[PDB]
Amino acid sequence: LDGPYQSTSFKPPSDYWILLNPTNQQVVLEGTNKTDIWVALLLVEPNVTNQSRQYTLFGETKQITVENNTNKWKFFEMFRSSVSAEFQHKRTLTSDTKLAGFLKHYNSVWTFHGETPHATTDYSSTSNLSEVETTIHVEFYIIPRSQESKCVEYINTGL
């Protein structure tokens, strides 16, 4: 919808879907309010044998075991609620579209999980939504939640 945005660090306005358009395996998003929510989406290329890859998350060097036995791409949703904790593999988006989503809405942070073309949304709660800031490493678009059905379309079948 709103055309290609270059990679940047910003606090997205609420009720707007950020639609990430990555090309290469990567840490594609880091989002936190530095209080009770840390979210990171790691893009894993197709046909990846179980192995521990090194990622930089919020200035910290982390080893994360990744695996992708499919021809599709997988977005690893790493999550922690306290800065002192280690990241957990909370959800996964298995995709042939290579698009992912990020939305701030009603005290929660919404992402997509499942497998295309049947990927669905889920959320994580936070006590300070307004202060969650995202470092989008890749090109992205912005779609309002008043057109969320369009963003579901793109997530599952592409732009």
Residue numbers in the entry: 65 to 223
What does the paper say about this structure?
The outermost layer contains the glycoprotein VP7 and the protease-sensitive spike protein VP4, which define the classification of RVs into G and P genotypes, respectively. RVs use the VP8* domain of the spike protein VP4 to recognize specific host glycans in a genotype-dependent manner. Our studies show that VP8* of these genotypes engages the type I precursor glycan (Galβ1,3-GlcNAc) at a unique and conserved binding site that is present in all P, P and P HRVs, and the subtle sequence and structural changes lead to an altered glycan configuration at the reducing end in the neonate-specific P RV, that may play a key role in the age-restricted tropism of some P strains.
The structure of the neonate-specific P VP8* has not been determined previously. Similar to other VP8* structures, the P VP8* has a β-sandwich galectin fold with a distinct cleft between the two twisted β-sheets. The cleft in the P VP8* is noticeably wider compared to that observed in the VP8* of P HRV, but similar to that observed in the VP8* of other HRV genotypes including P, P, and P. Comparative analysis with the glycan bound structures of P and P VP8*s shows how sequence variations in the P VP8* leads to the loss of A-type HBGA binding observed with P VP8* and how interaction with type I glycans in P VP8* is unlikely to be similar to that observed in P VP8*. The sidechain of R101 in P, which makes a strong hydrogen bond interaction through its side chain with A-type HBGA, is substituted by isoleucine in P which cannot make such an interaction; the hydrophobic residue Y188, which is crucial for stabilizing A-type glycan in P VP8*, is replaced by a hydrophilic amino acid D186 in the P VP8*. The residue R187 involved in direct hydrogen bonds with Gal of LNT in P VP8* is replaced by T184 in P VP8*. The residues Y156 and W178, which provide hydrophobic interaction with LNT in P VP8*, are changed to T156 and H177, respectively. The J-K loop that interacts with LNT in P VP8* projects away in the PVP8* structure.
